Design a protein around this ligand. Structure first.
Ligand SMILES: *[C@@H]1O[C@H](CO)[C@@H](O)[C@H](O)[C@H]1NC(C)=O
Ligand SMILES: *[C@@H]1O[C@H](CO)[C@@H](O)[C@H](O)[C@H]1NC(C)=O
Ligand SMILES: *[C@@H]1O[C@H](CO)[C@@H](O)[C@H](O)[C@H]1NC(C)=O
Ligand SMILES: *[C@@H]1O[C@H](CO)[C@@H](O)[C@H](O)[C@H]1NC(C)=O
Ligand SMILES: *[C@@H]1O[C@H](CO)[C@@H](O)[C@H](O)[C@H]1NC(C)=O
Lengths: 326, 326, 326, 326, 326
């Protein structure tokens, strides 16, 4: 055969651990590129971002050299990674118990030693979610690619010469804004220095799920508490309303506690609003109890009207403070 | 033996990476067929469709050639895939961390080099679910099969010559409509072009689960709110009803939020209806509070009757807008 | 040694892929037996039945032959399956991503070529659950064993000669009735025919869990709705009862929706009973609202009594329709 | 080297399948000991007991013999199990898909052939939980260790000579009582007999979790129903109380159904008590409805007092029946 | 090549099991260091602490010796662990079924035999959580590193010479306080002694999640019960309030039972407070029932006022007992 003849004369003394270089002091310019093709999910229960992405590798090789003219062309050979040298580049923040590479069993090589291994991975990364703007947030996620084993004396992890990765993966759940990747030198200690590549994926929330399960029932309960103090205390239904509002706000807290995770850096604004409808039922229940105790002059109507006006201006300033997000 | 004699003279210099071809510029017509035998599940929490399917492969081989007449027949040999060449065809949208394969340890070969490897897989695919018609949807799922490693210069991923796959797997949960598969040339870049095969599985919802857990309690709460404004405000039970309707609609929202996932492209119509019963309770609670404040002329009966008529025509036009799905 | 001397002269040219036969047209009678020793679980969320079972294999061999008399007895040798031929028999309906096998690393061989490999597996099978009789069902489960790779021209998957597997594994959760296994010839196409073995495990429900979490609260709410219309409408508690019945039936629907899975072929009878207590609260709430509107002649007592009698006969005929299951 | 010289002359013809023995009719006394160091969890959803334990093995060897005096001592050599013979001892009731053995890559050998392989495993075992005493139960768990492959003609699975394993692992969740292990001969059939070792771990419940989430709210609802019939029926709050008791007992059933698993052999006593507070709320709601129908002579006070006394003596005899557990 | 020439003359007779030493009685000083870089999660459902950490290893070697001057420098060689000796150091409390290792496929070696293998792991450890201070706890976690296979006669697991690991990983969920690691000699038996290293990670709770889902609704329900007894019993709403308080406290118990795990050593103080609001509703419901029975002299106002004062002083002393934590 033709490919078998060249393959029998290119891995004669090739190990999967020898760094391909001519001079020991010389390094290898292992280029890298990250291309997220589809963001799978973002769960804040354990700060996990699952994406599907291509991890483009490109390093020069010294031993994979052949002349094409005596081998009848054959400028591209498909070589598995189990019989070729492989860099130890990994996610710095991995959530899986092990690092997995879908379709990582093949890698092309060129006639100039231009291995272009492109595996595809379900990357599970860790990002800091600023949930003070929840749900209408713009918290970017950073993915780190580097080698923990060898350092800048062995490899030089750089960005791709052509960095045309300024895409926008408009999904049905998030708006994805790609950031042009940067290179930073992470230092293990003072004497030794390493390399690393940061890529950024900004996520913009656009779904109307959280405006349906949280915002609309909370603003409707706020509207109900705003309409609460018009009922006279002698009707024997104001306290029943108030305790029904307590039960409804407790069910809203049950939904929020089952949905919003344990990771809090700042209190969410929907959680702050739920605290508000609560601190209202408590305040208007106190005023209703005091009104029905005073009823047993009819001064309570003016007190309820001024209380309604104060709650009106407080609720409208809280809702226009909330509306600055959207 | 007879099979051992032929097997000892067919893998003398066979590697698991050499592409079987005679001329380098020539390609191999790697045929493909997808046959879903049983759709396991469809979960919209992370856009996962789990199916059980056969992935029929058929490629011509150049090195697996023998004359049968001097080997006493033996037109079919069972050869494991670990000692034979294997294409790198995969799902383009895989949800598992690694590609699973059930019964992939054997593959038949013919005397003309007609390897017919048929593995079986639990394919976990990603589809775009148009949930605006939820639950009575007809959102098709697309499964993509292609090679990321080699391109049209090496293999040619084509359809089966006999494409008799127009079945209909009538299950107890979905109606499965198979679509005749098509071939599209996905391009990694401008200079290089690759191959891919799209197969389609249309899912028709036929279960009465979502008509029992969502539609019937929501239409019963709508019927209850329709019957609400007949109660006189002096009976001290209209506000109690209204707040009980608030609690019941909150429990319905709790069931919907625990069931309907975070992925929303459009608001579901059952979710829109749950918004309607909510906006009713709020509106009829406002009118009940204003009626019991006016009661403390008896004009409220005509107001409640016209309100009941307006709610009657609005509820019936909303239900006949809903009934166009079913 | 004695075993090492025979082992060094029995795997001289043995591969893990050569089918052991003398003539090519001859087949091998690969016998099979299934013995479920303990049914682990049955979850209807994805039609999964987890059992622990022995998969008895017995095939004649042509190459594993030795005379015992010159080897000092030694009629039984323990040989691992990694160095011996192995059939590709599998579950036709597997739920795991890969086929698991517990204690599959050893297999006895006899002096006549009588390999008796008995692995043990946690089989995850798929069955059609007729949930119209839920919870008091008798839906059998079918487990299929066959080879997808080779056909009746190579192996002949037959029953055990001694089929004494008519046991009864009486567990604390189910009653297990073993069915005598049958053999059917599944056909991949018209020209080629394959083999398969069906074994049956009938499951009888005997637990009092579903009679405690579903049947007793639903029949108690039905009893409460039966006792509902005796309250006079002027007591201002009939509508409160009715809405409390709505809340209780909604909590019952919440428990049922969180427990009963998405797979419905037919509506469960407990679900039908729940849709009935709901259709009652709705009907008696309508009659209570009309009675309190008519009260604002005292004809409502006779109407409530005839309504109570009609609901009495309807509830008793529904409960004696339900009682035919148990 | 010294260890390399002995290691190069001890595995010259050693396979991982030859049973180490001199005479074929002779057997090997493979001793065994189980030492649970920490019980991880016990979940009754699928009868799983997760423990961390040492599985001490000790078998005599015939081929691992050397004289120490010409090898400069070296009485202990660390040998991995991949290059030494290994018994096929396993859990008879395993919940994992495949057998795990954390720290199983090394095993010491002595100069007399005294291999002392001690792996450590997260054993997932199956026990029969007698939940009639739930939560204050004393249901022991049995762990079975035996070989399915070879029988008493090959190995003899016996106890340790020194059985000092009478410890007591006092944890924060359970009290662990070790049982001295026994040996039983499990029979695959009539002609052939095998060996097995039973070890027992008795679990005593001591946590106050289930006395907080179940016992205290149920006894408080029973106290509330005991205090229920003192309210006069003309106050229009007795029926509201009763339906609030129905809602509270329904929430208690929701907590119990979400916590107590589907496996029931007998009804739990806490489940029987929730059942009492229910049938109790039903009976006093019937008597309250009949009292408010009779009110529309004032004989109902004596009826309510005798009903309260009967409920008092019934509740106190039920609570002293419950108190015999604790 | 240069690296290939040295690599072909350094693993000539190297096995992955020979302990590298010159004299048999001599030991190897296998140093160790633990560096937690990011604490992933702490779940008390099964006492699991998931951290991401570096496990620094450093042992002297006897066989990995070369002179650099005739090899043109090359003081550092990257060698995979599959072809080099590896200590069996592990977590003593592991929650995973098998020991996972991220980037463990490479390890540097120096010219003096100074292997510096640094793998990175998602360590799942077990700690005793003193939940009597929940949520404002300071329960440290202990991670144990040692070898179960060989003992102090073979290796000597010691600290790093430079122990500069006094960092503080200030996260958004916990405050991490590193403890300087210590060495303890765990004994398998009396005759033999082993080695082990304890490292400590103290976790300080700083999130406001549990102050939002538990503390604020419980203190608001306590405030509501404090405001409860002012309502006159003739208003027919005191019993309705009390039963609404019962329903709200039951929903709070539902949230607590779904969140707080089964592992209890001591009752949490938030759980004790939830007991207090419950025992109040029960006590004030008893007093409300007795007041409405006495109403059917007006001495109940003074009784309610003294009851309110006693509940005021009891609630304020309970809240200032709670406030000592924060
Ligand atoms: C790695 O590449 C960067 C790119 O500018 C260069 O500045 C740096 O000197 C390189 N490192 C080495 C060791 O050559
Ligand atoms: C692959 O097959 C299609 C089928 O028509 C053909 O048009 C195309 O030219 C083929 N590609 C190559 C490279 O031969
Ligand atoms: C397989 O066994 C059945 C048992 O009766 C027999 O009828 C059939 O002919 C056999 N098949 C072959 C190919 O021998
Ligand atoms: C195995 O050991 C027991 C211990 O008493 C002994 O009774 C039995 O005979 C032994 N079995 C064989 C086959 O030697
Ligand atoms: C291990 O190191 C400690 C450090 O002080 C030392 O005391 C001890 O003797 C050493 N053990 C051996 C066996 O050398």
């Amino acid at each position: 055969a033709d490919e078998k003849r060249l393959l029998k004369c290119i891995l004669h003394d090739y190990d999967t651990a020898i760094r391909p270089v001519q001079n020991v002091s010389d390094v290898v310019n292992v280029a890298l590129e990250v291309t997220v093709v589809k963001v799978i999910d973002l769960d804040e229960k354990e700060h996990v971002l699952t994406t599907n992405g291509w991890i483009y590798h490109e390093w020069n090789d010294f031993q994979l050299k052949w002349n094409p003219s005596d081998y009848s062309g054959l400028k591209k050979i498909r070589i598995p990674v189990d019989r070729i040298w492989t860099p130890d580049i990994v996610l710095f923040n991995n959530a899986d118990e092990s690092y997995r590479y879908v379709v990582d069993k093949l890698a092309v090589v060129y006639y100039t030693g231009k291995v272009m291994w492109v595996p595809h991975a379900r990357l599970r990364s860790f990002c800091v979610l600023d949930l003070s703007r929840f749900p209408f947030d713009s918290q970017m996620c950073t993915l780190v690619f580097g080698s923990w084993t060898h350092d800048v004396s062995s490899v030089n992890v750089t960005l791709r010469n052509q960095s045309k990765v300024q895409y926008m993966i408009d999904g049905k759940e998030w708006q994805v804004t790609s950031v042009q990747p940067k290179r930073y030198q992470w230092t293990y200690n003072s004497n030794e220095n390493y390399a690393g590549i940061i890529t950024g994926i900004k996520l913009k929330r656009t779904s109307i799920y959280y405006q349906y399960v949280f915002i609309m029932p909370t603003v409707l309960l706020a509207f109900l508490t705003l309409l609460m103090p018009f009922i006279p205390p002698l009707g024997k239904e104001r306290i029943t309303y108030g305790i029904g509002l307590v039960l409804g706000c407790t069910l809203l807290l049950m939904m929020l506690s089952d949905r919003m995770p344990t990771e809090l850096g700042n209190v969410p604004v929907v959680a702050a609003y739920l605290a508000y409808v609560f601190v209202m039922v408590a305040i208007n229940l106190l005023f209703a109890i005091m009104a029905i105790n005073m009823s047993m002059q009819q001064l309570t109507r003016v007190i309820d009207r001024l209380l309604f006006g104060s709650f009106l201006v407080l609720t409208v300033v809280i809702t226009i403070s909330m509306y600055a997000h959207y």
